[PDB]
Amino acid sequence: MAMFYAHAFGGYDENLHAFPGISSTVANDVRKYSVVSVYNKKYNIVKNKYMWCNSQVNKRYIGALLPMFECNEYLQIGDPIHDLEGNQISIVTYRHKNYYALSGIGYESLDLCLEGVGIHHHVLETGNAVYGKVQHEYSTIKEKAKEMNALKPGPIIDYHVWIGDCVCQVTTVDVHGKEIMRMRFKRGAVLPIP
Amino acid sequence: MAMFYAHAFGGYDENLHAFPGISSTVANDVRKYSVVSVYNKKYNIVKNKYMWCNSQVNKRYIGALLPMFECNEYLQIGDPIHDLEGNQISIVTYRHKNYYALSGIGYESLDLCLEGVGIHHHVLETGNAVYGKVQHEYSTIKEKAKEMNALKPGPIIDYHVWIGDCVCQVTTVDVHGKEIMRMRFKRGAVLPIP
């Protein structure tokens, strides 16, 4: 049937479909599921809140907002995840306390050649603003942006992913921390906790 | 009360809130509206399909997925848009045949400094694939991605915005046309028609 290999265990295969944490012989759209099963135990998919997950294999970044299900049991990487019809649709990859990512074709995504740049992930505090590589209170960020607005932009060297409860954002910065590009995804999410 | 200035008429003010085509003294979240009015006529907001609009002022790119209402009348840039309670919420900015953008805080947004780079917008044909700066059939694109895979990535010089009716994507390319980075949004949209 369908194969699912875990990047954490060396399973990355550039000729297979790639999603955060998985290389697979199939490309399942996991947005539709509301209930999944792990070892014949059912779990509900969380509504309107997701998990930003990424694997970094070779020099390639594979990041996306994924659905997540709530499970009080401890699950381990590679545990098969099934639909209610007995088909394996994914494998356990990432966790945030009792939330477990369902990896596959999900919501907003970021694919990037990591050659010559870095990438960093942050939990965005509710009410905080972002400029470049930092978050802070709105008025403080307004000043930091003003101190930086004069500079000439150098080349992108770093990506910064900001994961908040209402919005997610991606910024790029030069050597000084000046913001080159900002992108916002209008979805709320959490980051995995290793 | 709230002021709205059209970028097309020289109205950009960097100290005001910036949205596609608009500088304003207020920052209205326009996602919540299902109906609007212009000159005592009511119009419905289209569900689950949006307009990717942008203004480019100074060297600043201001792009976003905006809600959009269906109106068979010809409306002009700057025409006030109200809610159904008499408050002005926006002004007319961009049009795609009988669709009119509602500019403000919308869905996915891209802010970019255009220093040393270009940005181009494309209608993504349903069923087509993308590599870097081009779209074509999945088979032709998969060949292209394979020819290009050997190249070492260089710094980004151009951004490409792909607006499809189920998905929107932003890609970036270096001087050899190699795709450096891609972001995907799980929303369908159209582009304005000048």
From Swiss-Prot, chains A, B:
Protein's name in the database: Poxin-Schlafen
Taxonomy, superkingdom: Viruses
Catalytic-site annotation from UniProt: H17, Y138, K142
Signals that turn on the gene: Expressed in the early phase of the viral replicative cycle.
Similarity-based family: In the N-terminal section; belongs to the poxin family. In the C-terminal section; belongs to the Schlafen protein family. Subgroup poxviridae B3 subfamily.
Domain notes: The substrate binding site is formed by the N-terminus of a monomer and the C-terminus of the opposite monomer.
Spans traversing the lipid bilayer: none
Function: Nuclease that is responsible for viral evasion of host cGAS-STING innate immunity. Cleaves 2',3'-cGAMP which is produced by host cGAS following recognition of cytosolic DNA and blocks the subsequent 2',3'-cGAMP-mediated activation of TMEM173/STING, which normally spreads to adjacent cells and activates the interferon and NF-kappa-B immune responses.
Organism: Monkeypox virus
Signal sequence bounds: none
Gene: OPG188
Marked site: Substrate binding: R60, I105, N149, Q169, R182, R184, K186
Oligomer status and interactors: Homodimer.
